[PDB]
Amino acid sequence: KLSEQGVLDKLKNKWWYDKGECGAKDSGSKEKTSALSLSNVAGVFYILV
Amino acid sequence: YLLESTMNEYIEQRKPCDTMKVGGNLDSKGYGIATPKGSSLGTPVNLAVL
Amino acid sequence: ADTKIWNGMVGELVYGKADIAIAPLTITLVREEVIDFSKPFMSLGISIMI
Amino acid sequence: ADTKIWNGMVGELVYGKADIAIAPLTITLVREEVIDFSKPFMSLGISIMI
Numbered sequence: 001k002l003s004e005q006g007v008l009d010k011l012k013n014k015w016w017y018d019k020g021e022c023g024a025k026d027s028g029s030k031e032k033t034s035a036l037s038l039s040n041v042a043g044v045f046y047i048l049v
Numbered sequence: 050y051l052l053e054s055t056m057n058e059y060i061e062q063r064k065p066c067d068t069m070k071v072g073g074n075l076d077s078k079g080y081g082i083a084t085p086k087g088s089s090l091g092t093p094v095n096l097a098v099l
Numbered sequence: 100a101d102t103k104i105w106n107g108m109v110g111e112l113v114y115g116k117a118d119i120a121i122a123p124l125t126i127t128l129v130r131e132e133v134i135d136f137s138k139p140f141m142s143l144g145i146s147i148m149i
Numbered sequence: 150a151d152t153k154i155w156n157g158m159v160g161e162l163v164y165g166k167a168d169i170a171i172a173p174l175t176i177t178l179v180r181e182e183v184i185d186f187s188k189p190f191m192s193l194g195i196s197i198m199i
């Protein structure tokens with residue numbers, strides 16, 4: 001009965017995640033891209049200035 | 050399309066191989082072998098599965 | 100709900116026609132009262148197909 | 150293996166010191182013969198940490 005009413009799912013979300021110190025860490029794992037940025041070519045601008 | 054995970058893995062392995070599964074399971078359930086109540090097979094079947 | 104009659108593999112175990120059911124039968128609360136289940140041999144859940 | 154006696158929470162259930170055990174107790178075969186397990190409330194497995 002506790003399984004089908006989601007009360008086991010409710011307790012699992014509260015103890016594992018809501019008392020979690022790594023707050024909303026799953027959002028940071030999403031972003032990924034591959035291109036040249038300013039950090040790669042920063043020294044060329046420093047020679048230019 | 051939201052469906053059970055066992056059918057989701059089966060359609061992925063069939064032609065034309067166009068679908069995939071992402072993420073994890075949303076809930077938990079199980080499949081069980083069923084016997085009528087009070088039968089003599091209920092105890093040997095239970096120990097056979099484990 | 101009207102006739103209070105089970106149909107299917109659950110019905111054949113209750114009324115006496117079948118001796119055992121080896122099938123993907125989901126362990127639920129309502130089916131637990133009428134027949135007996137073993138430990139789960141397979142675990143599944145709801146997933147995403149894209 | 151030498152003395153054929155249990156210890157821990159499985160020992161307290163067999164020899165009568167307690168009445169119920171609500172704990173992360175894994176459903177195995179050798180524990181199934183001596184005590185009774187309910188349907189599983191949590192599913193798990195081996196995973197990888199990097």
Ligand SMILES: O=c1[nH]c2cc(C(F)(F)F)c(N3CCOCC3)cc2n(CP(=O)(O)O)c1=O
Nearest residue numbers: 157158159172173174175176177180191193194
């Ligand atoms: O029934 C059992 N349930 C167990 C449950 C857990 C936990 F995950 F913490 F709930 C653990 N740990 C895993 C990591 O190290 C610390 C304790 C051990 C368990 N063991 C001992 P096993 O023989 O190594 O499996 C059992 O016997």
